[PDB]
Design a protein around this ligand. Sequence first.
Ligand code: GTP
Lengths: 782, 804
Amino acid sequence: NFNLEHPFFFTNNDYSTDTSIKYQASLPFNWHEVMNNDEWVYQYPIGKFVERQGWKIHISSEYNSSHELLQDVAKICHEMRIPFKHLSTEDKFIMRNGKLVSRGFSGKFITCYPELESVLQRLESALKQYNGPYILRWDEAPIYLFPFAIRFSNSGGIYNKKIILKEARPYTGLGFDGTYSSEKLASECKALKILNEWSEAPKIYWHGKIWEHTFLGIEHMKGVPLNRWVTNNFPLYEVVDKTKDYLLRVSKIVEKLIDLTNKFHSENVYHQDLHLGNILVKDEDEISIIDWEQAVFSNDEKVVHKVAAPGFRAWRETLPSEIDWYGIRQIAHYLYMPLVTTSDLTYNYVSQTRIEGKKLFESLGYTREHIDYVESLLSYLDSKCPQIENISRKKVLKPMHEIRTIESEQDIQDFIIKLLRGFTLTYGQWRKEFQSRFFPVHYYGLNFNQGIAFSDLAILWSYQQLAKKVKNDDYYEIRTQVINEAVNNFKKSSLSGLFDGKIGTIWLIYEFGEIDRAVELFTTHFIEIFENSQNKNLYSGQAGILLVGLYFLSKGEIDNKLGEEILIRLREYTLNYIENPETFCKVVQSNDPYENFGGLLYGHAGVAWLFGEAYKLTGESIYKNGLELAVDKELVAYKVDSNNSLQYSQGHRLLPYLATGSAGLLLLINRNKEILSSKYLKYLTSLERATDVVFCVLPGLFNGFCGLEVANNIYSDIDDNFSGQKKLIEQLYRYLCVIEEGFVIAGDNGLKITTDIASGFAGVAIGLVSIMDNKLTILPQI
Amino acid sequence: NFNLEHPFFFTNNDYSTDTSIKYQASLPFNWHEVMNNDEWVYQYPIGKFVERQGWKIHISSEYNSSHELLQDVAKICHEMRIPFKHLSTEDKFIMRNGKLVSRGFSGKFITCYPNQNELESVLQRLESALKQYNGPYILSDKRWDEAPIYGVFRDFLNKWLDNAIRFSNSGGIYNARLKGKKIILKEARPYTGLGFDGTYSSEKLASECKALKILNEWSEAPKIYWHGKIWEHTFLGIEHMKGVPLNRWVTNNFPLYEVVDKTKDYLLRVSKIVEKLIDLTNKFHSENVYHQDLHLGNILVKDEDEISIIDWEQAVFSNDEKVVHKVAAPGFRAWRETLPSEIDWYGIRQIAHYLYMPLVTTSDLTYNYVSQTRIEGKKLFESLGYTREHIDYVESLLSYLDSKCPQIENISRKKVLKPMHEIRTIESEQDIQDFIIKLLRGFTLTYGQWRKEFQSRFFPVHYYGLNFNQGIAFSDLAILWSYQQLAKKVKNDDYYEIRTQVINEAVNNFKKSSLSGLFDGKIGTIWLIYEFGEIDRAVELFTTHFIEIFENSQNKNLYSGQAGILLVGLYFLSKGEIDNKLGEEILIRLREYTLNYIENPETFCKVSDVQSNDPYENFGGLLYGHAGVAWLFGEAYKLTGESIYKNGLELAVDKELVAYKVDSNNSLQYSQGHRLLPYLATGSAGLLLLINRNKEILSSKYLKYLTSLERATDVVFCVLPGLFNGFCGLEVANNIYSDIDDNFSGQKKLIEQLYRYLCVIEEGFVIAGDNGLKITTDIASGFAGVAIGLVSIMDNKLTILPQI
Ligand SMILES: Nc1nc2c(ncn2[C@@H]2O[C@H](COP(=O)(O)OP(=O)(O)OP(=O)(O)O)[C@@H](O)[C@H]2O)c(=O)[nH]1
């Protein structure tokens, strides 16, 4: 809920400052100027009888000369009573009258509240030389009370030969540099009427300024976005290619764009906005460019990039020929692998995702004669854009240049050592600036403190479990601080569950150490965690609380009374299961946890873990009956793929991986070999053809490739571990940054560094344990 | 302690934030950056063991070409092996080379850590790019070579091995003689001393070489005798002359009593000081000389009224632009963009307004503030009655200074505060009480604007005790208690929640207190619970903590020592609610206390030679010395009737009267360095607070001193408005123990003399504090001081010490 940008981490909305030019009134006594909202300077005067403050009057302003409106408005206040209040700084002026705010809070810069004669001529006589930012009638001045809808805005809009409608009402859409939308409509009116020879660019029709509104209407071009072409045409599955002839299809895009980009550099026009929402590929691979809103008609000036898409912003000032060659660089690298999203934080990002590409095509098997071609075309693009310096302290995130293969277990020995150091590093850059949480985390879980999730001590348990999995600073003092902090705030939290709730930290007060303190905490608090109805899912609900309770019962340290009625609670809960499966979970796309409604962790297959867990230590028939329904009703939402596979279908997106995909059910079948019949054990063949893809963008255990490999290489009845680790290691090298002697992992929507079990350091640290230790140690098995 | 400026209150070194133009170089493929302690950024190779203790390299820079040296030694030291660190913001470059930061941290912008086998190698190609740069002089560091290159981390370099009144980082404001004729010097050193409109010391110092040469011939200006360059260090010499500063001259020649000076004739004396200034400030504002800085420590009045303005080291030589005032004075600075000729009408104007009623100090916090020190000077000299014919002359001649001044539009957030413009005279009852009706708004309106922008405390305080949140003194519990007793005096807000979080963390942080004492320690927080309206918590905390509090206490005075502990002990015994066996024990503890006291009082409190305003640098006084012991013995003689305890009163007042001197007015006054102190807590009001009402015990030997102190505590004007160090105690102490009923002289003189101290904020009468660039609500100089002193005459005993 709290989106803000900081160099490295995310932070909640308490970090930003207001270092701007302030506004100032110079008014006499019997008026207050006391601030109360940090927006206005709030004034109710002295010696009053204040009215009920009904219908209000309003005055608006423009950025061109508003050091002269306020001073003339302030000299009206010497005569008569008025609630005079203006805005604080120019930053609130830009935000109030600019890009994305509502229509109600736009145009307001100075305030009068109507008791009076409702008219005064000397304010009308010192003004009406200023007119602009109208708000959508009693007098003159600024007072505001045809030759023929995909993105609404208060500034303008885009509305559906059929023609599109690009418009801009006057004096709006102010940026940090003072330019407007109608100031760039004329920029398109120059920049596309200067070149009408080409067929890959529309025709300008300014039809009329009805009222006074700047319009620019261009016809609908034909083509597809290049992202959809990549995800519909990249060799994800290994046989979808038409016996090669795709890296030659790359040569159409990597020749047409180069042969077109040098020809508008001879017309003194530079487009300066080059991302993947502009290049539209027609049928029979014809290209088309759009959105010429940022065209500067100069070469010797230097502009730092202001508005772009995520991925392709320039770095610390360059000549504007380079702000169109940088796009042709990082889009011709985009076709090779789809990995450019991190490049807003990491500069010169495409070296490691271009080195591994030749290794990818030689492993899949392509002819070298076709391959040695695009590697020279990309080498030609290094001549145009020069090396620039990395400033603004996003500069430590350094991509690797050398990558070596895997030949022994010592590769896994040093991988863990170079992964654990990048947890001390990302703590040492978080503790020095903030103190609300204690470890950095992905932005949606930015205020959570409990359970196996976006957390504070689950990541510390993941830190020590792999550190004990490997052999040989300040673990114990931070250990003592977080253990005391957890037990201090164990109350006053209003959520219950295993991954997010209260009994999760009961599990890690057991497993983290401190065996006794866990059992008086359990005997004190388990019943008032339990009894209060609520939900049923393993992420947050009664199955999460109950299963770690039976883990405690089967461990062997419990009194007889608790071992009686806790087993009575699970005997009750499985009988309340009986026939109705829609109670716990549902039988659109996102990457945040709470709006998902299916999978292993968020869905039906979590209850299957409990039903398979109870059968050992019980051995009775009803817990066998519940298990196969719990596996079968998870597979309702699976559709047969194009080539003999099964995936989770949520919207247009296709879902691999552990949390909400085929991998969790594959792992759950792979564990329970003995109780499952031959009809359900034969589904390994279809799911193994699903969980072996060559590319999946997210790196985490809860999201992406680590969940794909930890489902395959875990049980298998075979003690082979080296081939179980080698594939995940060699195909997780393309998702890593390098900070000092160590690695970090950027989370989903990657512009960050994170530590969590929901796509960060700790997720791969659990998965690499679960490869060799064969338990999946963050899910209760006993 | 902890002082920092802010538009209104003071605060500690937290509210500073930062804004500057930043820094920082590149890093190709083998490096890392860390944010160490918010004034360095640090780059080092990814894994290398280097060296301990051997050698490092410090690089300074210059403010004009600062960035162009970072990208000159970034890439010349990325090659080979050099790890380094440097400063992060420009405003810390203003501080590291500056004027207030000492010698130890100076000339340091970039710090480098080469390895021991490369010390010749790391600089031989690093220096060659730097030959067109230069920087500050070498302090707290060593010399290596030309260009800006010159400890612990976690070789070839062996070869190269009259008086002073101010010390600063600029170089000195020293005083010497020619190789004679007496010379006042200034000094500077390379590229040092900057502001936020940063210009160097050798720029402002050379910006008077024309201003003292244009005038030169005149008889009231310095004459430059020597000027030149012995080194790059700049020596400017102007001739020393005799005289007295005007701020000392005002206190030397003002009527402080009605009987100080005969012949009358003081408004005729201030005629030659307000004509010579006004024609002098037109004589040199024609030949292009504009002196921006003018204050009371500048004009040296000579024998028989002769002004001698010096130190013209802020001179601007043309007036066709509007500038802001850059360096201020304690009380005098311009306001919002005026020409350099009209920074001598908000200049020399307010200097000659110090000759009438000497309070101009809070003009930095209140715009204008000569209305109150001009309106209520005419009243003073009509009540004192020198001559009426001089009054209109001086008023018109000051109005001409007002006439030449421009009316600047007032704009800041230091502009809520106007000076007050109407003053009544009280004779009736309701005119006394209306000041109480709106002085309470001066306590309410200073509460919001401290808590809403800073949350580390609860109430604004004077900066001497800022992190001392316990006691009767600078505190939190005593402040809200002083409010309640004054509010009960007037007839007819939500202070119940306020007092419950006062009571809660009055005792929550009781354990985390390293000091014990009556006014600033543990036991004061105990018995404010008893006098604030809770009777049982006082007893429980009293037993359970006060027994170890009396165990661990060390000192024997009554501020922070043993005396007030057993004093409030006998207070609790006299009211006698819960004590019994503990009361018998406390009486026993008093028995070994007094008999150990009676042997030699010299080694419990010292029987003052330091000029200070600090609570912990005092030796003699009522609270701060021996009269508190006589308060305890005076009360111990009352309850029991025991005849041993009368012998302590005579010994205490015999020891306290050896310090006071006799002067031309035959006034017995406190001696503290060179300063006479008629005040409640550190002087002559203390013994008058003690001696009377103990006149039913003592008969003849200690009632002949009452009339001398009664006459000696009758000053007309003193500057501080406080209880323990200000005026308000002097109108309490003079009639506090009156055996004849008298209230109008106790509530009319004090509220006629405390009209000259008040700002407005908004419909309020807010008091300022010690060194009053601030509004404070504390008990020494603030809201609680006047809230206790007015109640004191009304309830006729006292409300700072517990009565037995
Ligand atoms: N007795 C005497 N003292 C002088 C004379 N000329 C200058 N001074 C000294 O100069 C000092 C001026 O002090 P300030 O008002 O602080 O000015 P400053 O020395 O430039 O220091 P700043 O506050 O930074 O401006 C006085 O304290 C005097 O001691 C003189 O002719 N006679």
